[PDB]
Design a binder for these strands. Structure first.
Lengths: 320, 899, 238, 210
DNA sequence: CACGTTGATTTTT
DNA sequence: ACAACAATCAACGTGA
């Protein structure tokens, strides 16, 4: 598989965006109790239940772009530090720090996910993404769990007085699916392996990741195109309607019905498409990228080349 | 009375307007019942009535007292010949025309003729069509004046042409004139408007219509329009003196911080240098006030003074050292340019020339100016016999000596006046009186300032609250209502310009808010302030703007506990709210008229839900009471207007998600407000039952109360049981059994599975109530009420998961039969009734037990709970609570209908 | 010559830092023309450099022929987008944060030590336009135009469904006189042979729009209740 | 340092032990029972003045031999930090509510996997282990620990993770003994955990709370 | 840019 | 019987 796809990608990172998009179609499946919160509640919005002309509105959980992109992004930076392509030490010549002045201008993270220092340089994110939505309703997709924090002596009382340390917290359930399209513009082949790496290699999202929030990123198709294909909301509303609301289905029926709904949508969207990797060609492509991420020699080679390409972009067209 | 009656009857003056008062006493409260629920037909008729009454005052002959009554009735009927005289009979009696005058049915021919020719067998009583002349021209003037959308719509042809030929046919020799102010900045906009009003009344202008951005006036035909260069100097003197006296009293323009007392940039303009130094003894007597932990001992500790001097000072370290050190500090920091001409004065106008050398008074680090705290502590130690009030009498005299001495020497500058200049240019862009010359704005400067906002050739930051078309300056802790120094997308990224920018216009506005709302500087945002703006349905009459003045300056601080109490009492008829005391002859006549009518909540709890509970209620309420259109927002900057905003009656910008979970729209038409208030008071009256404490409403838990109500509707009864547990009451009142059920029916209304579960929980109990009836009069336990349902659920849960539904139905019906036969015979409706043969009582009992058990195992367990015991175990508690409320409701319904 | 009625539906929440007050950053309820013009035509017509460095990294290139990210390319392509009218809208106020990438985090005061430079340290609240919203714009062009059925806008590059119809020559008509525009309109793009008689304004970066205006000049009555200014092009007042 | 803190001044620290919610391999219906509890007066009856106490209620408890598959994960440890966390996993034995009366458990460590990143969720190992048994869950704990070992190795060969070391079976029951030999020796444990204290105090002064 | 420094509000039957 | 949390998230001034 990967040996055939090497034709599609750019040979080196371009200055101007050229309109080659590789789109990853995924179902992110909740595995243990994620908490996609801001403002003290699970983020929700009213939406129409499905594309077939409903009167019927539906409150669905929203995983914002930040809440999914940053856990992918940071799981790339720790891989680059483990390969020794970047460093955490302030005295190293290849230091990179995530947000401040100390952000690199060369490393793969900085070129694919972007940076903004100010006049000393900025770079646009090549990884495009959207806010993901629960396939079902909030009322079906959450439960509220009490927590307490007693004295170590096992008691809510100490010295005869009670601690105020009790509250509820709101959690998403262990089967909730978030249909997602992640999209990568104008990437080199190794840029596609780094980003697809993040999608498969990162596994925790949202708050309290030390204790909760595992998700399984099931990739459902890869689609090469001249442009943007569809939104997460539009895929979710199509997928709800293909099921007619019988949301209580096993993971593999939910992934195979997403593979045919994706192809039903791609046929209507007006962008030309070079490749549509689905089914047994996706399962061989996934095996061939798993084989890179398990091999020390192969991965240090590819990510070494990515480094070089991004260090060359930096010095030729980038922030120098 | 209704709140709308209560506000309106204050605006009238009985000596010659009593007939309009008779209307507000009787037709008005019926009007807002039928027409009150875009635009509302009650607010259209009220503004139409009032505008025709204001037009009537100009007529050169007085309209007859009988004909004034025809105008007042005809203008109400106008929103809809024997086929129409009956539609006038039906609607008049509904609207209580009788109480205006009993005579009205005599004049019904005329009253219906004015509201829509031949007599059709109904001859007119009013003498001749010379009396239908003023009546018809009055009525047709009001019902076009109230349809204007901006003050310009009388010079724009669409409706203004007919307003002139109407006024000419009325023979009035007045002329329409306007003012408009395009740019709408809050209190400064209100001040500009009310200074134009206070100016033009001297020309005998009289306002006829009010709009959110302006006024239309009846003004004489031989009057000069006021000169542009004159209303500029009048309106600057108005705002600059009104803010001037506030800074002079000290409630604005000064702030205490750790480097001592600060002064706002605009204080340095609006007060001359000589003025501020004469006011400082009074502003320290307000702004320097901490007697618990004053600064002087803390300041002297870090001086490391030593040398057996320390105790001479420390035994007199008190607030009265601070006040003097803070005065000397601010005069040194802001009034005098070189220190040495002034350190030699203060060290000899006080008696400290010897004790303290000139240079040892200037010791500082980080601006904290420690040296003056040593100076003050010597003067306060030497004169230690003083108290705080005889000290302030010293320091007032010391300031006036300093003031006179500084200006005899000339040691202070005639400081710049930049906010006057930019304000004169703000007026030249955005104010217009009809017949002013006007220019196209140079919008290039607004772009040029944005294009350079992050480039070295910009000296001060660009405004964070506007576009930057006027000169801007850094935000100050003593000017703005919120944090000055947080990250900005408008300041350059990675630059040292960490303070944000404010236009010099918005700097006067934030100071006018400190001065006239009396809110904190730099700290008001921590009160979680949400602002409700009461915009017009395009037009207000002068009496309605006076009515909205009496509201926004006089409205009671809402407490939801008694709004709950007066609505669960009065049987949830929302009309009850019309009558409650929402306020605290006109009483606010000296305050400016609210062109942008703002009211605001303040909270001391930290969460977004705690902020929104009063604003969300008030933003539904005021449109339901007054027919006004409300926008609720966190933004201190108000929303820029368009015809799209008016397409709903209410907007709520970013409510806590409890709103969306309930499925209430974040913008509402007038048809939607009574659904919305019912759902909002239903969630409050359920949250104040459970997840509350009697003095502490715990609105931080309203998101937990709503999510439970929406997840499964039986939680409405689980929460009613928690409230009974807190109140330590063993059973609900008869009222509670229908209240909490009408709430469950309200929150389920749109949902198929909730309406099915709420119908099922009634049916479930209505089935066992065929064979078991404990009488509630005997004060039975929750367990005795639930005897058959508890023995059904325990059966489903106790058997192995392998066994069939049709086995469960038989084993559980056995346990129900076994339990029933152990209760006393009066509890068993089929067996106690001796009228029919014993095997037929047994046969009817067995089939009644079987059908109930079949509903438990088929529909409750199999369909609803998915046939899973885990999902039933979570619900066991709320199924039980829902069945107790169902049993009490079925019993309350039986004991009524058995009559 | 051609006119396209384009209605924009938000498929995720849109943020622009239009004004800032303390912890709160908020989005104006009208999408500015120049923002939508790059959302439609950047990469297809206007260049899209992935990187910036220098003065070009914090100075706009809106109407500067010397730079590649101009809106003037579109003057030469014969295309003009108008700003966007909100048909239906809602706001969500949502917090956003800085990540603690290190195992240890100190809450640092903004402007304190180790925090002395303008970056998004700590937290802020964004008043975003929500998924529950719909906006209306018009594109006017002199050539049949292959408009993208998806665009991205704002601070977080948020997806909009564009569903588009060409307004056919049987239902538009051309006229000249005094007209109430009733759509939004950017004063910088106003040519000679248009003059603005009345306007109501929405104060907004980079430059204020009109939300309502009365104009004198040429127009197209594109349906029986809206009138669109003819001959507008990017920066025509310069 | 290893389990983190977040109250008061001097900042907050993220847990280097990453943990997740664990799931029963079997269904709830085969895996729980409800037991009545009561509380009489010390006089041995539910009355003190003829009146009833009525202090009677149910509580649900998980049955014995119910098994919860889980992966605990430790990031950026020193070797002494691994011995501390692994010590907690072998040395703890009570878990639920009412420790004083209930809730003993037996933790069988089935593998230790050194890794470049996160392996599978608890739920995924559970759903793999149920499928491998066909739902025939009435198998002895030795057969169940040997079935978990082969599914964990099947799943690990499908993870995009470089695996430096994969301690299982006969190498793991070697290592578990070499760690029991630490926790049964007063000198070895004091030395090791004392070194950890220094390591964690130096992290604190160098990068943490100072 | 890099040193230094430390006060304020008013209240939710 | 009894707790519903607990903290932290500048605002300048002065000299070089």
């Amino acid at each position: 598989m990967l040996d055939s796809l090497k034709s599609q990608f750019q040979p080196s990172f371009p200055r101007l965006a050229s309109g080659h998009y590789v789109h990853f179609l995924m179902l992110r499946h909740s595995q243990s109790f994620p908490v996609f919160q801001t403002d003290g509640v699970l983020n929700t919005t009213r939406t129409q239940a499905g594309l077939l002309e409903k009167t019927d509105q539906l409150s669905r959980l929203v995983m914002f772009k930040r809440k999914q992109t940053t856990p992918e992004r940071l799981a790339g930076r720790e891989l680059l530090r483990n390969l020794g392509l970047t460093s955490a030490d302030k005295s190293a010549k290849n230091l990179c720090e995530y947000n401040g002045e100390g952000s690199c201008k060369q490393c793969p993270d900085c070129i694919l996910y972007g940076f903004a220092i100010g006049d000393s340089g900025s770079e646009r994110s090549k990884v495009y993404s959207d806010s993901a939505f629960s396939l079902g309703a909030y009322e079906q997709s959450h439960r509220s769990f009490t927590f307490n924090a007693p004295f170590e002596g096992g008691t809510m009382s100490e010295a005869g007085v009670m601690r105020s340390a009790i509250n509820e917290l709101d959690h998403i359930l262990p089967e909730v699916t978030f249909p997602t399209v992640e999209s990568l513009r104008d990437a080199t082949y190794e840029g596609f392996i780094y980003v697809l790496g993040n999608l498969l290699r990162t596994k925790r999202y949202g708050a309290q990741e030390s204790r909760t929030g595992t998700m399984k990123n099931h990739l459902v198709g890869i689609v090469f195109a001249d442009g943007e294909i569809f939104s997460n909301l539009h895929l979710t509303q199509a997928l709800y309607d293909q099921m007619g609301g019988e949301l209580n289905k096993p993971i593999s029926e939910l992934c195979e019905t997403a593979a045919t709904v994706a192809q039903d949508l791609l046929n209507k969207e007006p962008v030309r498409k070079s490749e549509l990797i689905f089914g047994a060609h996706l399962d061989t492509l996934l095996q061939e990228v798993n084989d890179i991420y398990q091999n020390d020699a192969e991965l240090t080679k590819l990510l070494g080349s990515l480094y070089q390409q991004t260090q060359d972009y930096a010095t030729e067209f980038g922030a120098l | 009375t209704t709140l709308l009656q209560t506000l309106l009857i204050r605006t009238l003056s009985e000596q010659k307007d009593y007939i309009l008062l008779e209307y507000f006493q009787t037709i008005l409260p019926a009007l807002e019942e039928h027409f009150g629920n875009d635009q509302t037909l009650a607010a259209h008729i009220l503004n139409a009535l009032l505008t025709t009454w204001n037009v009537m005052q100009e007529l050169e002959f007085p309209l007859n007292d009988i004909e004034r009554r025809l105008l007042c009735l005809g203008i109400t009927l106008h929103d809809y010949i024997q086929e129409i005289i009956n539609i006038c009979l039906e609607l008049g009696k509904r609207l209580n025309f009788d109480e205006f005058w009993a005579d009205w049915r005599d004049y019904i021919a005329e009253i219906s003729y004015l509201a829509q020719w031949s007599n059709a067998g109904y001859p007119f009583t009013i003498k001749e069509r010379k009396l239908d002349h003023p009546l018809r021209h009055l009525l047709t003037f009001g019902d076009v004046a109230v349809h204007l959308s901006s003050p310009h719509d009388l010079v724009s042809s669409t409706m203004g042409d007919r307003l002139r030929d109407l006024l000419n046919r009325l023979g009035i020799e007045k002329r329409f004139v306007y003012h408009h102010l395009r740019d709408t900045t809050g209190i400064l906009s209100n001040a500009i408007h009310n200074v134009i009003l206070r100016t033009v009344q001297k020309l005998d202008w009289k306002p006829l219509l009010f709009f959110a951005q302006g006024v239309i006036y009846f003004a004489p035909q031989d009057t000069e329009i006021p000169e542009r260069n004159e209303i500029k100097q009048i309106v600057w003197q108005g705002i600059s003196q009104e803010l001037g006296k506030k800074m002079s009293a000290g409630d604005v323009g000064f702030k205490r911080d750790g480097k001592g007392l600060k002064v706002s940039p605009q204080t340095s303009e609006l007060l001359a240098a000589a003025d501020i130094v004469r006011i400082l003894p009074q502003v320290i007597s307000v702004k320097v006030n901490n007697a618990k932990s004053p600064a002087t001992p803390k300041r002297l500790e870090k001086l490391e003074l030593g040398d057996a001097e320390r105790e001479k000072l420390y035994e007199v370290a008190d607030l009265r050292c601070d006040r003097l050190a803070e005065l000397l500090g601010l005069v040194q920091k802001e009034i005098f340019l070189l220190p040495e001409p002034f350190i030699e004065w203060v060290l000899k106008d006080l008696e400290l020339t010897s004790v303290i050398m000139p240079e040892e008074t200037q010791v500082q680090s980080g601006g904290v100016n420690y040296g003056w705290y040593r100076v003050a502590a010597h003067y306060v130690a030497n004169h230690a016999t003083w108290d705080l009030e005889e000290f302030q009498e010293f320091l007032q005299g010391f300031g006036d000596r300093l003031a006179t001495w500084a200006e005899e020497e000339g040691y202070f500058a005639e400081h710049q006046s930049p906010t006057r200049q930019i304000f004169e240019d703000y007026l030249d862009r955005y104010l217009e009186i009809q017949g002013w010359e006007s220019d196209h704005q140079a919008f290039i400067q607004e772009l040029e300032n944005y294009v350079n906002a992050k480039t070295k050739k910009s000296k001060q930051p660009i405004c964070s609250l506007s576009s930057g078309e006027f000169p801007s300056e850094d935000q100050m802790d003593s000017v703005v209502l919120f944090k000055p120094q947080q990250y900005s997308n408008k300041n350059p990224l990675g630059g040292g310009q960490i303070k944000r920018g404010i236009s010099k216009i918005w700097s006067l506005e934030m100071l006018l808010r400190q001065a006239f709302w009396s809110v904190p500087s730099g700290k008001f945002e921590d009160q979680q302030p949400i602002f409700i703006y009461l915009y017009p349905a395009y037009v207000y009459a002068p009496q309605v703007v006076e009515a909205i003045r009496e509201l926004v300056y006089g409205i009671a601080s809402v407490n939801l506990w008694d709004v709950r109490k007066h609505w669960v009492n009065n049987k949830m008829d929302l009309t009850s709210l019309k009558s409650l005391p929402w306020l605290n002859q006109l009483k606010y006549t000296k305050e400016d008229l609210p062109f942008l009518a703002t009211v605001y909540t303040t909270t001391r709890e930290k969460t977004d839900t705690d902020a929104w509970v009063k604003p969300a209620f008030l933003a539904l309420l005021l449109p339901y009471l007054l027919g006004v259109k409300a926008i609720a927002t966190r933004s201190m900057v108000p929303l820029y207007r368009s015809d799209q905003d008016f397409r709903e009656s209410i907007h709520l910008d970013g409510v806590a998600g409890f709103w969306s979970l309930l499925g209430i729209p974040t913008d509402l038409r007038v048809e939607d407000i009574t659904p919305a208030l019912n759902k909002l008071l239903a969630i409050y009256t359920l949250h104040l039952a459970a997840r509350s404490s009697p003095p502490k409403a715990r609105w931080q838990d309203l998101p937990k109360t709503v999510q439970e109500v929406m997840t499964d509707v039986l939680n409405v009864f689980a929460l009613a049981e928690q409230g009974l547990r807190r109140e330590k009451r063993d059973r609900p009142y008869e009222s509670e059994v229908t209240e909490y059920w009408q709430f469950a029916e309200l929150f389920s209304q749109g949902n198929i599975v909730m309406t099915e579960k709420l119908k099922l929980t009634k049916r479930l109990v209505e089935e066992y109530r065929r064979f078991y009836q404990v009488e509630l009069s005997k004060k039975p336990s929750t367990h005795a009420i639930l005897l058959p349902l508890s023995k059904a659920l325990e059966q489903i849960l106790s058997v192995p998961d392998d066994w069939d539904e049709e086995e469960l139905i038989l084993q559980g019906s056995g346990q129900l039969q076994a339990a029933l036969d152990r209760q006393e015979v009066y509890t068993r409706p089929i067996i106690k009734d001796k009228s029919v043969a014993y095997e037929t009582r047994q046969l009817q009992e067995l089939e009644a037990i079987q059908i109930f058990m079949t509903t438990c195992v088929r529909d409750l367990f199999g369909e609803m709970c998915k046939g899973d015991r885990a999902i039933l175990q979570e619900q066991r508690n709320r199924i039980k609570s829902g069945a107790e409320f169902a049993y009490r409701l079925l019993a309350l319904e039986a004991q009524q209908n058995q009559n | 010559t051609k006119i396209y009625r384009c209605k924009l539906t938000l498929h995720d929440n849109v943020f622009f830092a239009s004004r800032e007050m303390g912890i709160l950053y908020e989005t104006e309820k009208y999408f500015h023309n120049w923002a939508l013009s790059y959302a439609f035509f950047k990469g297809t017509i206007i260049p899209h450099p992935y990187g910036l460095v220098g003065q070009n990294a914090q100075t706009p290139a809106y109407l500067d022929r010397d730079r590649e990210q101009n809106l003037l390319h579109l003057n030469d392509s014969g295309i003009y987008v108008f700003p966007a009218q909100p048909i239906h809208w809602s706001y969500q106020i949502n917090t956003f944060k800085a990540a603690q990438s290190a195992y240890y985090g100190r809450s640092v005061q903004f402007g304190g030590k180790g925090a002395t430079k303008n970056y998004p340290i700590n937290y802020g609240r964004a008043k975003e336009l929500a998924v529950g919203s719909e906006f209306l714009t018009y594109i006017v062009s002199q050539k049949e135009l292959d408009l993208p059925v998806w665009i991205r806008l704002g601070k977080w590059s948020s997806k909009i469904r564009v569903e588009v119809e060409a307004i056919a020559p049987d239902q538009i008509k051309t006229a000249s006189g005094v007209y109430v525009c009733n759509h939004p309109l950017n004063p910088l793009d106003c040519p000679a042979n248009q003059q603005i008689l009345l306007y109501n304004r929405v104060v907004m970066p980079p430059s204020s729009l009109f939300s309502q205006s009365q104009l004198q000049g040429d127009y197209w009555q594109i349906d029986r209740n809206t009138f669109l200014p003819q001959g507008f092009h990017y920066g025509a007042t310069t």
